[PDB]
């Protein structure tokens, strides 16, 4: 029914990946993609990021016990990265 996807994204010139996030352990709501900015890096990588995708790992980090704000920081940290690339393992149904 549900399956895991590894998504790999490089930020645009502004530093953004082109998606919005909701949830976190503070939000009593799993952590999920709420928006894909059309034609952004998140929309244009293969495989691509989808609205409603549940975030499982961020750069191999299990984020199930981290706050919303923490996860946003984890996302930003991957621009200062080695490959400057973001690697998300997501779950889709």
């Amino acid at each position: 029914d549900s399956y895991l996807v590894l998504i790999r994204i490089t930020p645009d010139e502004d530093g953004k990946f082109g998606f919005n996030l909701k949830g976190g352990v503070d939000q009593k709501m799993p952590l999920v993609v709420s928006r894909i900015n059309p034609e952004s890096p998140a929309d244009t990588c293969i495989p691509k990021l989808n609205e409603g995708d549940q975030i499982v790992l961020i750069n191999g980090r299990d984020i199930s016990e981290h706050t919303h704000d923490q996860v946003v920081m984890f996302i930003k940290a991957s621009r200062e990265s080695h490959s400057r690339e973001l690697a998300l393992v997501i779950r889709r149904r």
């Binding site: 919005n20 909701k22 939000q27 919303h68 946003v72």
Partner: peptide, 6 residues
């Protein structure tokens, strides 16, 4: 109910 642009 937080929503953040990434």
């Amino acid at each position: 109910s937080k929503e953040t642009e990434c």
